[PDB]
Amino acid sequence: AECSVDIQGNQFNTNAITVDKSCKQFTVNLSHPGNLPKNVKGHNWVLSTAADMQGVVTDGMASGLDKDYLKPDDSRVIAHTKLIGSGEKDSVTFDVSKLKEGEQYMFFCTFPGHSALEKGTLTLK
Ligand SMILES: [Cu+2]
Ligand SMILES: [Cu+2]
Ligand SMILES: [Cu+2]
């Protein structure tokens, strides 16, 4: 099965990612659609459990641009890309051993305000 997915904003281009349970690693390739720099309007892709999302997003906003809008040493973050701006791309590869069938995961952007629209479910199946 395939073990990668391409994601970009148009809102993400998908609101549901499925990871095949035979994948040992999974890769997300994020690209930035727009013409603004990352300090003005950046994007990232961040994965956590559904329950942990709000905490990751809220603490991330508080931590600010210098920290890529993530709280340092946030153990709730399962995987993430860096924050990117216009013309940039970033990929993250993570171990599928971090995911479990039946559990609910969310992916989202933690740039301030983006997670209302830039979010989706991730499922291991
Ligand atoms: Cu395969
Ligand atoms: Cu395979
Ligand atoms: Cu964003």
Side-chain angles (χ1 to χ4, degrees):
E2 285 317 291
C3 300
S4 69
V5 63
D6 290 351
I7 298 180
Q8 63 180 60
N10 46 19
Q11 294 296 326
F12 282 132
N13 68 327
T14 181
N15 59 28
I17 295 168
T18 299
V19 177
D20 192 288
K21 56 176 175 64
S22 71
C23 295
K24 304 308 293 182
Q25 298 197 301
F26 192 78
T27 302
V28 174
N29 304 297
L30 183 71
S31 56
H32 193 304
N35 47 18
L36 299 161
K38 78 184 169 187
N39 62 305
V40 171
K41 188 169 178 165
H43 297 298
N44 59 15
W45 183 93
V46 184
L47 183 67
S48 78
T49 61
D52 281 342
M53 173 179 175
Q54 200 53 75
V56 171
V57 169
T58 300
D59 291 350
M61 184 169 66
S63 302
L65 174 70
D66 287 3
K67 299 305 174 53
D68 258 19
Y69 290 108
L70 291 170
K71 192 227 304 186
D73 303 314
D74 194 338
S75 60
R76 295 167 303 191
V77 176
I78 298 169
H80 66 96
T81 70
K82 77 169 55 184
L83 191 74
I84 58 176
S86 168
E88 309 179 333
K89 58 178 189 184
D90 191 48
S91 297
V92 60
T93 300
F94 63 93
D95 294 338
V96 171
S97 62
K98 289 180 175 222
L99 306 178
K100 181 180 180 45
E101 289 191 57
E103 300 301 297
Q104 317 183 58
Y105 305 97
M106 292 290 298
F107 63 90
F108 46 89
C109 175
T110 62
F111 192 91
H114 288 195
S115 68
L117 298 189
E118 273 165 71
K119 68 171 177 173
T121 63
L122 183 144
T123 314
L124 185 66
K125 281 204 258 181

